[PDB]
Design a protein around this ligand. Structure first.
Ligand SMILES: Cc1cn([C@H]2CC[C@@H](COP(=O)(O)OP(=O)(O)OP(=O)(O)O)O2)c(=O)[nH]c1=O
Ligand SMILES: [Mg+2]
Lengths: 437, 57, 218, 1006, 69, 57, 65
DNA sequence: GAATTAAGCAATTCGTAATCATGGTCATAGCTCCCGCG
DNA sequence: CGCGGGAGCTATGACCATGATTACGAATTGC
């Protein structure tokens, strides 16, 4: 009524509404760069703006093609002439490109999925982001489970000083060649080899990107030749406590590097066949492409697991193995001293308050899954098709109900390792009962 | 039995051709895969004419 | 810059070409209400009821909407005071001075800003009375404000009670900001930060922000 | 000082006064003023830390403050819900005060005035005059409402005054404009404080010639020149329009208890004040009871947005800016909110309301003499018809032909009416007050004295018809119970939706139970499952179907499970079956099944696979106590419904108990509603989950249940679906039925709480008494705690198109074999408002034909389909060519709103094009008539595209042009579609649907 | 095998090899028509088995390269 | 025993062809005679290649 | 038969099939030589010689002069 | 001058629009033979 | 005798028109 307005209107003109609108604008300017949490926050702010004002210029997004090509351009395989000036040279690495935007997460390029990172690297990323707020995102590279901070694209500040600051926080860093060319120089391949050896890295450097001080939208430079050589076999190489990298082997003996297991599947490579490969002077880079096989993704994974070994399974970007999971793997996951008994284990966690708080924060199932190094979705799919007998939060008997998930080789391999999962799960359950009850 | 050993040599040579297709077909571009697909359609229509010849007589 | 003829005391309406789809309906509505409207001594003179129709609408992206002219000394342009004695334009100038830092000004004018059309919902009122001519200006106000919100990106309304139903007076959705009146008690227009909200909502629509310092009269 | 509260109302000025309009036993209207405060509830530490002291602060006692925030937990270490027990204070200031962490701010100051002072708004009070200070004559000031309103005497009758008015305005166009078109007639039903019901119509003498004025004076109509000459006792008074408007101003300025109109705030009163401001400059001045402030009548919009979708504006109501205490009541808005009808124009409401069956005594060439009494229709139908016929002029017979009343006679127990009707063969006919067979604009063109007196009669019929709709809908009793129950002012009772009318008794119980509900985290909405709707097992039912329906299912669920936002212990979710089974085991050992109910729900998120909500039943929740209050109100009005004799009183109390039922279902729905203060996603989700288990349990006992040798055997045991209880679970249950009865029961349909139990018998009486035994035995052995079912009806010839779409003959529990059954349509084409009258008539005719062809049983179903589709083709071609059915048979209805996800929606564009092109405007929430109109040269169109572009809004002044025609193919396609869902032989149906409409028909799948 | 670059020339080479085998089976068909028109009695059950197995081989080699996107 | 009966039917068809050419050859006219002569030179080129393939061993 | 157009047309048309079958015999002889089986072509050489003698008689007869 | 509302979901039908199956057509790459000039 | 120009044919991928499927909102109603 006239004590209650012609229509109920909220406080649409407050400083909180202005802050929400400015946050909505900032998330709109970084829609292609953000994690799914910031996309959902953007959609919540769009819904608030459409409820608050009758229309807004921005709309809800359902799927976003996560690409960072706004600050890049067309890569040229041909030699070209440089412009004079002061330049900032960067190496481009082989591994999967990740971005650490203002959404505080590690965002995978081409999928937009937030990827789980170690706590020290995440803490260094928060220190870098809280040091200066002008940075749009941190271009990260994941190769052989090594988080190196390739680039720090900032809107207002020059990227030279942030790199040593990140190296102070324990972030892995590349070497830099900040030389004023000041003349027209043609990038021959011999100069490219000089530049790559002047980067002084044994890590696989696949392209070179240069930054101008007075110019944004930096350009990546790649010289290569497309090749097709014969593949003898696909082998694995140990890069961690449990994870393995894929690496196809030629008939001659050259090792073509594979980006991830997803790169191995997506190229649809099998033995005794040719591959679409980029050729470099130092090493070999398999090109990123979608293979033209008639088999599906699951059949490709079946053939790959049947080739490299039955005890390997697809664990995110890497192959993880099956072995005996005792107390030493639990102490390796908990990053503490090795213990032989449950008593020494709970005493050691009683010594370390940070590990004890970590055990509080995440549940028994998550601790037992991360100790075994299982993937999240595949293990959830496996356990959601099994049956359990529980006595005092312990698995005294397990049996699978639906065997249709066993067609996945990863799920079948983890079902083979499920006895060790039961052992680790009961051990972690006993640790939780003894420490906090 | 000249036709028998002739078709046996055809089977062996085409086995070599199909394993080379299996070697190169994952990484083919669209236009050359289109060309080899027209070649395989000519393959199929020629063999169905051969099957009609050996069926009707 | 077309013109039509009406049968009552303005006797002509000079209007921009962007006002063409709503003029004949405005002619018939004003011809049916004007003989009752013009008995009262209106707060602008009848010759300046339709000054804002001379303004173009394609270049406007922001509508600054009041419910009526000032009860006295209305000049036909909304929120315009040559003496600069009106309270509403004084608090508007105070808010823009707090926004931009321009404190050395003689007056303010929302008409001289690019992209901003100052609007009165009801185009007149009786002298000394607020919303007294809503009776005569209801249909015209609805027609002309939907014509504005077809063109502008952001509609800004200066009254909580006056424009609570402005989402019902319009039917096509536009960016609507129902703000506090400048003469509201407890200084809610002093705590109002709506012009920044206008600029941010323009940047959300990929539109040019309103440089609010263009309205200052030195 | 014995008063009865009529209306409560606040001062419009800045100095906030709360007023009571009250009436004593002698008939004196007494006004009581109160200082209206802004009420805030703070803790004791906040109260003593207030640097400005409160104007008034009262101790509310040690009340617990519970954080109602729903946190899911992946383990069973749920932290206890944050209960902060503290002394709380009721902070009162005359000005609004922003207090940090002030709780219970969802309630209004008026509800806080009522409940903290113990005042029932529908209450009779002996006022202590030592707390009353007289301001002027009839108005008192009460500084202390606690001790003045302390003696609550029982209710006594008061002489309420009323002003029912309708006006008639001239119009050359389709609609009057207040700037060019005058008011022709203003009719009034004046009801004085002495009970004197005065009927008078003021006729504008400016629209009549002077010879016609003198002729009406010779006929007896009074000529007046001012207000002093005006006599309310004269039935017909001639005046100028200025004198007419000053009489309207004088009447509306009177302190009536109710000024009641139909569409009068939007049109009649607004036209009165606009024409009064135009012609003489005066304003209708409402003054305060203490006369400190005086406001003018300005009709203001109140626009409701929807709470679903994009929350666009869905409804607008119009109200009077009045502060004298008169409840200016628009019946149009009231029946819009309360009823669900095709049209809400006054003729449609009068047709649906005042319908009576009347038999024929005399037949003539042009006159038909009907009589109606307690034998022709139900008791009170004919008395209501006679009351409407006292001022009525036109009676519609069988809802299609309009007959003028020649002679009228009001009997002791009914009516006697002579109608200008063609001779009709049948003995009884439905008499209703429907459409009028006049064209008002044409009568305004050739306006003479006889047309003026006829329109004065129609105007006084409309003004008294406001009174007849006021008494028919029982707005007096509904207003009183809304003041008592919802704890609201009487003018504020109907003009608010669920949340507001919850906020009163919820505040009453929150003060009673010393419970405070607060929120810290953001409320998040997820989609949750609703009631479980079983598929119909058969398309036809030759057997009797017993209908068992839970008595207030979702309220009884919430009371049974103690489903409240604060009694939720926690929500336990699991992403995997290992953690699900571990949480299941620690759930059974941690929470005892008697004290805690663990409700298994579907997950709110895709990664979760289980979701169990635990509710503590040790302390009764706020939502269960609110539901107990509303089912107490519904039970007492159901008891008043069973004790009612007249049909109008039965309709009133049935609407009253249905209103309390919907309010209880809204206590449910507000926990599913994210913007509500009582939002508990776990509680609403658990309520649907428990109700789903209740329908599955009642189906499992009833499906496959057989009766044998007087022993009732269910298919499954009588186990509680949630835990183990002390009652017997044995399905073998002793009856009170004879041994020789051996029948089988099977469930064939279910819908949320209803289960459709098909008994193999066909006898009505035997099925009713066995179903009564089933109801008694289910309520005694099958059901538990507050769960009760009742047996409503035996469904003979249950024709079910789909889920929620059925047609049946109702044999109620109080009915028998010899009692006549009523035809219940539920969701079929006859009930839906987007279905035309031609469509409804043809579905009824062809359903009767299909029932005849299935009851004959002598020919195959394919021949039945052949003959039905041939008759359908003949009827459709005859309607397409002859076009004998008028536009009225094809008028579809739709409600106008702005709640559209697309800004370019065709419906809203159609209404805005109508509002641009026409003087009549369609408001938000208005139901308008639209029809598919195409040019008449267009032939039978096979493929139907751009169908919404052919929609034309039909109003009362719309005439179908010679160049235009009804676009028959759309209605024919929908009609043929539902018939081919009725029929078998699907291939022939596809072939005929392709040769008429060029497309594949959609068939329902069982 | 070994190493190759610009695989379109190897595609042209194996297209030429398919041209050779297409002319070879056309030679077989056009001498088979002549030997059937000669009027000699022949039993071609094993020949039909050879054509069936070679057609299955052709289908297996085709099915990897038929359909894009 | 398929190639010899195939070339026996071929040489019988060519016997019929040579006899009908000798029947119609009382008049040939110059351009069609040059056409069948150039077809005969292509045919004897094919015959020379076949003779090379049977004498290469 | 008048104007000898149809006769010339259907002796040109048959010669295409004849040279197609001759190249067919050459291709299947290449197939049976590349298969690795041992064959003798003495009667084939005799047929080639007498076919060559009759077709060079045809060469002597075909000339227009 | 401001002042805060606002029940849930299930299920069916109907119109509209995006998506896809089927089919017709249109450039287009083979493709293969005829004609021709050196 | 040998290879280029040309022209009829023959599929063949690509593109577009038309109709059937399905998601998707709206309206409505059962609850
Ligand atoms: C009508 C309606 C119902 N509900 C819910 C709430 C309960 C179930 C069953 O209610 P029903 O009317 O069948 O019977 P019910 O009211 O439960 O019991 P009665 O037979 O009316 O006593 O549906 C609702 O949420 N909103 C509504 O408008
Ligand atoms: Mg019920």
């Amino acid at each position: 009524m006239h004590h209650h307005h012609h229509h109920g209107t909220g406080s649409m003109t407050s400083s909180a509404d202005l802050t929400n609108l400015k946050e909505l604008l900032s998330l709109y300017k970084s829609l292609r760069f953000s994690d799914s949490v910031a996309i959902e926050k953007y959609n919540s702010l769009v819904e608030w703006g459409t409820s608050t004002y009758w229309k807004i210029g921005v709309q809800k997004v359902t799927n976003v093609e996560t690409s960072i090509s706004d600050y890049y351009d067309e890569v040229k395989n041909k030699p070209f002439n440089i412009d004079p000036g002061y330049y900032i040279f960067l190496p481009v690495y082989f591994g999967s490109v990740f971005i650490y935007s203002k959404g505080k997460n590690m965002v995978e390029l081409g999928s937009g999925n937030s990827f789980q990172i170690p706590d020290e690297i995440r803490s260094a990323c928060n220190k870098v982001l809280d040091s200066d707020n002008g940075i749009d995102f941190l271009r990260f590279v994941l190769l052989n489970n090594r988080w190196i901070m390739e680039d720090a694209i900032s809107k207002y500040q020059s990227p030279v000083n942030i790199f040593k600051l990140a190296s102070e926080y324990g972030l892995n860093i590349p070497n830099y060649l900040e030389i004023e060319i000041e003349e027209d120089t043609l990038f021959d391949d011999e100069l490219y080899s000089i530049m790559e050896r002047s980067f002084d890295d044994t890590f696989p450097k696949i392209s070179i990107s240069y930054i101008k001080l007075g110019e944004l939208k930096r350009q990546v430079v790649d010289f290569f030749k497309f090749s097709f050589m014969y593949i003898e076999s696909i082998k694995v190489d140990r890069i961690g406590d449990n994870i393995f990298i894929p690496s196809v082997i030629t008939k001659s003996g050259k090792k073509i590097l594979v980006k991830d297991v997803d790169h191995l599947i997506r190229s649809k490579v099998r033995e005794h066949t040719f591959v679409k490969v980029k050729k470099k002077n130092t090493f070999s880079i398999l090109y990123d492409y979608d293979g033209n096989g008639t088999e599906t993704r699951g059949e490709v994974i079946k053939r790959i697991i049947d080739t490299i070994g039955r005890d390997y399974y697809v664990n995110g970007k890497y192959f993880s193995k099956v072995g005996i999971a005792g107390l030493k793997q639990l102490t390796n996951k908990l990053d503490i001293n090795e213990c032989a008994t449950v008593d020494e284990l709970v005493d050691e966690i009683n010594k370390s308050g940070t590990v004890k708080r970590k055990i509080k924060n995440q549940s028994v199932f998550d601790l037992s899954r991360e100790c075994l190094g299982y993937p999240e979705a595949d293990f959830i799919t496996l356990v959601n098709n099994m049956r359990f007998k529980i006595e005092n939060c312990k698995v005294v008997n397990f049996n699978i109900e639906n065997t249709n998930c066993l067609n996945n080789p990863s799920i079948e391999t983890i079902y083979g390792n499920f006895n060790q999962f039961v052992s680790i799960f009961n051990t972690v359950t006993d640790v939780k009962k003894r420490l906090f009850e | 039995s000249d036709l028998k050993v002739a078709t046996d040599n055809i089977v062996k040579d085409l086995k070599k051709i199909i394993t080379r297709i299996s070697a190169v077909s994952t990484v083919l571009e669209d236009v050359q895969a289109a060309g080899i697909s027209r070649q395989f359609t000519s393959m199929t229509k020629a063999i169905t004419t051969l099957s009609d010849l050996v069926t009707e007589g | 810059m077309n013109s039509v003829t009406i049968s009552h005391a303005p006797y002509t309406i000079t209007y921009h070409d962007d006002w063409e789809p709503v003029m004949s309906q405005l002619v018939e509505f004003y011809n049916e209400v004007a003989s009752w409207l013009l008995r009262d001594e209106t707060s602008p003179i009848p010759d300046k009821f339709f000054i804002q129709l001379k303004q173009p609408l394609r270049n406007k992206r922001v509508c600054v909407c009041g419910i009526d002219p000032y009860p006295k000394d209305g000049t036909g342009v909304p929120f315009e005071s040559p003496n600069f004695t009106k309270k509403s334009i004084k608090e508007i100038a105070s808010s823009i001075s707090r926004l931009t830092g321009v404190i050395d000004y003689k007056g303010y004018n929302l008409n001289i800003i690019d992209g901003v059309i100052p609007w009165n919902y009801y185009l007149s009122c009786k002298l000394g009375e607020t919303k007294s001519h809503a009776i005569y200006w209801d249909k015209i106000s609805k027609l002309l404000l939907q014509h504005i919100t077809k063109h502008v990106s952001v509609l800004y309304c200066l009254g909580k009670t006056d424009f609570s139903n402005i989402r019902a007076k319009l039917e096509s959705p536009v960016t609507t900001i129902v703000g506090y009146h400048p003469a509201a008690r407890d200084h809610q227009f002093e705590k109002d930060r709506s012009f920044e909200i206008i600029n941010v909502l323009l940047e959300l629509d990929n539109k040019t922000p309103i440089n609010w310092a263009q309205g200052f009269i030195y | 000082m014995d008063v009865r509260c009529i209306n409560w109302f606040e001062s419009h000025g800045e100095n906030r006064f709360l007023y009571l309009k009250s009436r004593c036993r002698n008939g004196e209207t007494v006004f009581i003023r109160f200082p209206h405060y802004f009420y805030y509830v703070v803790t004791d530490e906040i109260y003593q830390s207030l640097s400005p002291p409160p104007f008034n602060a009262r101790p509310m006692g040690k009340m617990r403050t519970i954080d109602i925030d729903e946190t899911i937990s992946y383990n069973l270490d749920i932290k206890d819900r944050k209960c902060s027990v503290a002394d709380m204070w009721l902070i009162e200031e005359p000005k609004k005060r922003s207090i940090q962490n002030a709780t219970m701010d969802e309630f209004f100051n008026i509800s806080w005035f009522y409940i903290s002072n113990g005042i029932s708004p529908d209450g009779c009070y002996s006022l202590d005059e030592q707390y009353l200070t007289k301001i002027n004559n009839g108005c008192y000031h009460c500084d202390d409402p606690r001790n003045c309103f302390a003696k609550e005497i029982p209710r006594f009758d008061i002489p309420r005054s009323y002003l029912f008015l309708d006006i008639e305005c001239h119009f050359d166009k389709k609609f009057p404009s207040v700037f060019i078109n005058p008011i022709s007639h203003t009719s009034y039903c004046y009801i004085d404080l002495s009970g004197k019901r005065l009927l008078f119509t003021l006729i504008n003498e400016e629209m009549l010639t002077e010879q016609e004025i003198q002729e009406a004076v010779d006929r007896g109509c009074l000529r007046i020149q001012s207000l002093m000459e005006m006599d309310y006792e004269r039935e017909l008074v001639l005046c100028s329009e200025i004198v007419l408007l000053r009489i309207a101003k004088q009447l509306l300025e009177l302190t009536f208890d109710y000024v009641v109109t139909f569409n009068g705030h939007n049109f009649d009163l607004r036209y009165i004040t606009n024409r009064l401001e135009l012609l003489t400059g005066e304003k209708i001045i409402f003054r305060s009871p203490d006369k400190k402030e005086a406001v003018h009548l300005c009709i203001y919009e109140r626009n409701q947005s929807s709470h679903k979708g994009v929350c666009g504006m869905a409804n607008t109501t119009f109200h009077v800016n009045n502060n004298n205490g008169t409840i200016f009541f628009d019946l149009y808005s009231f029946i819009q909110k309360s009823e669900k009808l095709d049209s809400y124009k006054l003729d449609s409401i009068s047709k649906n309301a005042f319908s009576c069956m009347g038999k024929v005594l005399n037949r003539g060439v042009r006159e038909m003499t009907f009589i109606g009494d307690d034998t022709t229709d139900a008791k009170g139908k004919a008395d209501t018809f006679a009351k409407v016929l006292t001022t009525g002029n036109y009676v519609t017979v069988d809802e299609d032909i309009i007959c003028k009343v020649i002679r009228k006679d009001i009997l002791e127990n009914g009516f006697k009416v002579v109608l200008s009707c063609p001779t009709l063969p049948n003995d009884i006919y439905k008499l209703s007050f429907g459409k009028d067979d006049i064209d008002l604009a044409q009568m305004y063109k050739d306006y003479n004295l006889n047309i003026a007196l006829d329109m004065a009669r129609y105007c006084i019929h409309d003004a008294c018809l406001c009174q007849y709709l006021w008494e028919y809908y029982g707005v007096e009793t509904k207003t009183d119970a809304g003041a008592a129950t919802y704890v609201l002012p009487q003018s504020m009772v109907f003009e608010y939706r669920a949340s507001t009318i919850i906020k009163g008794p919820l505040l009453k119980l929150l003060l009673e139970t010393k419970t405070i509900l607060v929120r810290s985290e953001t409320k998040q909405k997820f989609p949750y499952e609703g009631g479980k709707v079983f598929a119909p097992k058969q398309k036809m039912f030759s057997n009797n179907v017993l209908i068992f329906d839970y008595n207030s299912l979702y309220p009884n669920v919430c009371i049974f499970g103690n489903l409240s936002p604060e009694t939720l212990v926690g929500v336990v979710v699991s992403t995997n079956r290992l953690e699900e089974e571990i949480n299941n085991q620690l759930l059974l050992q941690k929470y005892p099944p008697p004290r805690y109910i663990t409700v298994h729900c579907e997950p709110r998120l895709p990664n979760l696979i289980s979701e169990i909500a635990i509710f503590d039943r040790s302390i009764e929740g706020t939502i269960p106590r609110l539901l107990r209050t509303f089912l107490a109100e519904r039970a007492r009005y159901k008891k008043m419904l069973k004790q009612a004799t007249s049909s109008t009183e039965k309709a009133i109390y049935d609407s009253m108990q249905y209103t309390y039922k919907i309010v209880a279902n809204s206590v449910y729905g507000l926990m599913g509603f994210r913007n509500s203060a009582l939002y508990s996603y776990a509680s609403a989700k658990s309520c649907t989950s428990i109700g789903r288990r209740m329908i599955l349990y009642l189906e499992s006992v009833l499906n496959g249940a057989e009766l044998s040798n007087g022993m009732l055997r269910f298919a499954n045991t009588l186990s509680n679906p949630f835990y183990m209880d002390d009652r017997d679970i044995n399905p073998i249950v002793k009856t009170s039925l004879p041994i020789d009865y051996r029948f089988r029961f099977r469930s064939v349909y279910g819908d949320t709480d209803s289960v459709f139990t098909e008994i193999d018998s066909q006898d009505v009486d035997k099925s009713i008494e066995i179903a009564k035994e089933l109801e008694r035995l289910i309520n005694s052995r099958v059901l538990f705690n507050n769960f009760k079912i009742e047996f409503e009806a035996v469904y003979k010839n249950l024709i079910m198109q789909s889920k929620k779409k059925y047609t049946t003959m109702k044999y109620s529990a109080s009915s028998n074999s010899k009692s006549v059954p009523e035809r219940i349509n539920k969701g079929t084409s006859e009930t839906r408002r987007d279905v035309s009258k031609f469509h409804k008539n043809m579905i009824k005719t062809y359903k009767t034909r299909l029932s005849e062809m299935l009851s004959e049983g002598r020919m195959n179903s394919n021949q039945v389909c052949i003959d039905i589709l041939r008759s359908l083709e003949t009827d459709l071609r005859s309607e397409f060519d002859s076009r004998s059915s008028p536009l009225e048979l094809f008028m579809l209805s739709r409600m106008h709103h702005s709640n559209y996800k697309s800004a370019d929606n065709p419906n809203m564009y159609l209404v805005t094009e109508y509002n641009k092109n026409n003087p009549e405007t369609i408001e938000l929430g208005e139901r308008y008539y639209f029809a598919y109109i195409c040019p008449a040269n267009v032939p039978w169109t096979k493929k139907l595209v751009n169908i919404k572009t052919y929609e034309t809004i039909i109003d009362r002044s719309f005439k179908l042009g010679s160049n235009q025609r009804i676009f028959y193919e759309v209605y024919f396609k929908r009609l043929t579609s539902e018939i081919v869902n009725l029929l078998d032989n699907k291939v022939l149906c596809i072939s005929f649907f392709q040769r008429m409409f060029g497309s594949r028909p959609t068939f329902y799948e069982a």
